[PDB]
Ligand binder design. Structure first.
Ligand SMILES: O=c1ccn2c(n1)O[C@H](COc1ccc(-c3cccc(C(F)(F)F)c3)cc1)C2
Lengths: 282, 280
């Protein structure tokens, strides 16, 4: 079995998750919707690729039974494929806030210095959002099912990530431990208490390993923990790749919300991050 | 061939049609849409259930599927939109009548009376020209209205039958003219001048058909069209009734619609009067 310490480590993460993860997206409201030189062109062509991968239809089920459905353009002359970016900005921003709240209720994270709390959330925010998104991914229909909202589409790393993680059929406890391990990465830019963070991450990984030994049948889940650790490594790479895409798009066509600007780097740490700081302070 | 006077007549109507019928609906704007989120009344709404498509000038597509009837109130979701579209069509019809010499010479009160009586009908006639019978959808530029046995609903049957006749533009516009100059609309004073005008349009229609449609597919075409116009008059009455029932339970009509659908003429129709006095 798990040590008492480990079971309560899990209890605390699971309670943090249930307090701060709106799984039906009921409180996602007031979001925007798609409306109803040589160097510059070199920037644009890189951005066109970046936005292609980024293609979903959007579905909108009302209470009455009505359904609105949005289908994105094909890429033409220019702007029309920035159509979804305001909506996406709002969805991510909503998801980030939940992730910030998640971090805050965790004693282990609270005790860290505010500046490290900021650095860790800057470093992991995208990864935890994707981990949460995976839990509402339906691999049969290639659809993220977010309450009344749906996003519908394997070489794109992000998409293959979600099919792959979904195949592992993780438990809630394993997802939330994944979130902890990603959140407490000692090797994020700007982290100071490297030693403390590392020991905390190791605690979580050990806890995750132990959970798997104890709760899943023997030889068949022999390597599950290492597979999960491999997924985290792949997610970390997707994070970096995705940040660079977002920064290129932002550069030519600004879309990021204030909070997103703080996270992606768009004086001091707390001063470059007044919103994040506020959100952590309350 | 046609007399000179008839050629001229058709030319004026066709010119009028072209000037006042935006077939790409490019200037239909600022309409309401369903939010993103009694027994007789429910029967009405259900017969004429459509899904709505809007294509962006960029390639994008929004599609809206209506709720199944599960109780009430959700069955009214498309009404504000339908009212905006009908109001846009009616204004085009008003412009159409305005540019016709034979109409603008009538007393302002008859102009009002004829338009009250015919607007719905002319609107359906224009809608039929953008009706796709294969797909069951009215194709209005970037907007589309797709039907969700159905011929049982007189409105739907009308559009299918009329589409089947494969009329020319000339024939649609002569139908519009005949419907417009109905001497027996309520409140019409110069019923005699109107009747003579209607008779000349009907004669021109019959002559046009004889000078242009030899094929046995078109035998009796003129008489079918006139029969269709009588049927359209009956649908008009029916649909006006449906609308009052629905407006009673649940208001949705625009101010211009409330004017057209009733019930000193100029005083009770301030918007019409205004549009008629305005230059075309
Ligand atoms: O916002 C969403 C909506 C759906 N999904 C998701 N994020 O992760 C999966 C793949 O689809 C995506 C579409 C857009 C983004 C996106 C767009 C703009 C900004 C951001 C970010 F969070 F990084 F700021 C993320 C991410 C993923 C599934």
């Amino acid at each position: 079995g798990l040590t008492e310490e480990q079971r309560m480590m899990i209890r605390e993460l699971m309670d943090a998750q249930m307090k701060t993860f709106d799984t039906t997206f009921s409180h996602f409201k007031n979001f925007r919707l798609p409306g109803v030189s040589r160097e510059e062109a070199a920037k644009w062509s890189q951005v066109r690729k970046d936005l292609c991968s980024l293609k979903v239809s959007l579905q909108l089920r009302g209470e009455d039974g009505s359904v609105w459905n949005y289908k994105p353009p094909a890429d033409s002359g220019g702007k029309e494929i920035f159509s979804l970016l305001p909506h996406m900005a709002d969805m991510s921003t909503y998801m980030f806030k939940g992730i910030i709240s998640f971090a805050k209720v965790i004693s282990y994270f609270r005790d860290l210095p505010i500046e490290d709390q900021i650095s860790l959330l800057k470093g992991a925010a995208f990864e935890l959002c994707q981990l949460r998104f995976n839990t509402v991914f339906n691999a049969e229909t290639g659809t993220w099912e977010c309450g009344r909202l749906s996003y519908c589409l394997l070489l794109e790393p992000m998409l293959k990530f979600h099919y792959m993680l979904k195949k592992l059929q993780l438990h809630e406890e394993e997802y939330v431990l994944m979130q902890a391990i990603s959140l407490f990465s000692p090797d994020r830019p700007g982290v100071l208490q490297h030693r403390v963070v590392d020991q905390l991450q190791e605690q979580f990984a050990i806890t995750l390993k132990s959970y798997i030994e104890c709760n899943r049948p023997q030889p068949a889940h022999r390597f599950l923990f290492l597979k999960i650790m491999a997924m985290l490594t792949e997610l970390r790479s997707i994070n970096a790749q995705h940040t660079q895409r977002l920064l290129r798009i932002q550069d030519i066509h600004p879309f990021a919300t204030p909070l997103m600007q703080e996270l992606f780097g768009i004086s001091s740490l707390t001063e470059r991050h007044k919103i994040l700081h506020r959100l952590l302070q309350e």
